[PDB]
């Protein structure tokens, strides 16, 4: 996936 | 926006070369002194060319 959704 | 390496002492001192501040334009007051910065009323005697105007 490699989704950049860092919180 | 994050420092990669810490600044060394010598680089910090080289950057602080121009951080110093200058001597003001201070001159002899003709009434009493000493001394009086240029183009301002003297804080001691309250005179300016040359009346006591406070």
């Amino acid at each position: 996936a490699a989704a950049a959704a860092a919180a | 926006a994050v420092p990669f390496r810490r600044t060394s002492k010598m680089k910090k001192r080289l950057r602080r070369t121009h951080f110093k501040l200058n001597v003001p334009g201070m001159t002899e007051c003709p009434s009493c002194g000493e001394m009086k910065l240029s183009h301002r009323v003297c804080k001691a005697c309250g005179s300016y060319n040359g009346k006591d105007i406070n």
């Binding site: - | 910065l37 183009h39 301002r40 009323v41 804080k43 300016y48 105007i53």
Partner: protein
């Protein structure tokens, strides 16, 4: 170009009217230097309005002078003071009714202060 002095235009007008009237009563005030430079032209323009002495110049000056008492136990307003004392005092002099004398910097903010006086 005139200065903005860090204020809104309405605040600029109100502060300039306050400083002009306060210079007109107390005859010597101590402000910052740039406020003095912005104030002196307005003050000599209002003295020039007081020079004419007619009703229209007085009604022009009434739109700028705030309603504070000038002379105690006489009930004299500032607007009467322009047309009674200042205009008769500066009848011969053509301009240059104020001078600015600089003081040292202020303690709290380093602001260069100045003495304003009617001469």
């Amino acid at each position: 170009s005139y200065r903005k002095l860090g204020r809104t235009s309405a605040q600029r007008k109100a502060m300039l009217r306050d400083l002009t009237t306060d210079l007109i009563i107390n005859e010597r005030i101590e402000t910052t230097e740039t406020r003095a430079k912005e104030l002196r032209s307005v003050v000599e323009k209002m003295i020039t309005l007081g020079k004419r002495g007619d009703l229209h110049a007085r009604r022009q000056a009434a739109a700028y002078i705030r309603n504070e008492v000038a002379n105690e136990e006489n009930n004299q307003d500032a607007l009467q003071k322009l047309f009674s004392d200042i205009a008769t005092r500066y009848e011969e002099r053509q301009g240059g009714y104020t001078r600015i004398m600089k003081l040292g910097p202020r303690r709290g903010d380093g602001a260069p202060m100045a003495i304003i006086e009617l001469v």
